[PDB]
Amino acid sequence: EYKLVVVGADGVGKSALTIQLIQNHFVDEYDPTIEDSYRKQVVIDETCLLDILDTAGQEEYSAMRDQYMRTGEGFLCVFAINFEDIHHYREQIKRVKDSEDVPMVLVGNKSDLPSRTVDTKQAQDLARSYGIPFIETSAKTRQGVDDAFYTLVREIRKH
């Protein structure tokens, strides 16, 4: 079993990527407030249960939310390709997990939107500084959604 957590900002589309991976249908205007975890038996390279944990809700640095995030062994940091709060997210994952080399994967979603305010080379340079792969993804186009979750699983295996 592999435990994957999908961290990211508002409207960045974290729920859409996990619904695309599991339900295989694109969700329009999915509830930002609702937070649910989904389990899925998938074949990668190995039959395993890659259980996602779409994150949602208001900023809470309580002991309880920390422990909930600490449980996930793989993190998918998502940002819209249309700001730099990602370092905050990455620095907080690093705190609860107590590691500089947590299995993580930078993901720039909404990569079908023609307006990009972030350079693709800029993110992969950031991903290179972190030491983690960057997978471009489009939940509407259903492109790269599987790769991001799958490369996170391979990073967890490498760990």
Binding site: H87, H88, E91, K94, R95, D98, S99, E100
Partner: protein, 144 residues
């Protein structure tokens, strides 16, 4: 609590530089003043942590909880970040009293249960068993 972090929520980039032969545990005193353990730093390593203004940090040896110094003092409060430059925090060994240094050495060589087997005066056993405590040092610091 006199000794606590101010909930400023104002980001201040800081450099934690371990200039001590010991593994350093940064400890962050939270808003209620309770010490929080943060990732350790191996001897010689430097890391650009992201903290906040008015935050209150102290630093100890990670295995024995011996006290360490930061910028020639016991505590460190990130100052107003200027033109993006990081605030530097040099973690260093204090000049410990010779007695305390000896207690540190004996504590490492002798498991706690065999302190009383050592050929030392009984006053020294009580000293041996009086291990370094972050909370006890905090009360002294509040007094000062």
């Amino acid at each position: 609590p006199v000794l606590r972090s101010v909930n400023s929520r104002e980001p201040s980039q800081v450099i934690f530089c371990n200039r001590s032969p010991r593994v350093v545990l940064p400890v962050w005193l939270n808003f209620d003043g309770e010490p929080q353990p943060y990732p350790t730093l191996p001897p010689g390593t430097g890391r650009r942590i992201h903290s906040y203004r008015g935050h209150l940090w102290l630093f100890r040896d990670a295995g024995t909880h011996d006290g360490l110094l930061v910028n020639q003092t016991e505590l460190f409060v990130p100052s107003l970040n200027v033109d993006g430059q990081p605030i530097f925090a040099n973690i260093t060994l204090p000049v410990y009293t010779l007695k305390e240094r000896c207690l540190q050495v004996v504590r490492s060589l002798v498991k706690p249960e065999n302190y009383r087997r050592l050929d030392i005066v009984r006053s020294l056993y009580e000293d041996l068993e009086d291990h370094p405590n972050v909370q006890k040092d905090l009360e002294r610091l509040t007094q000062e």
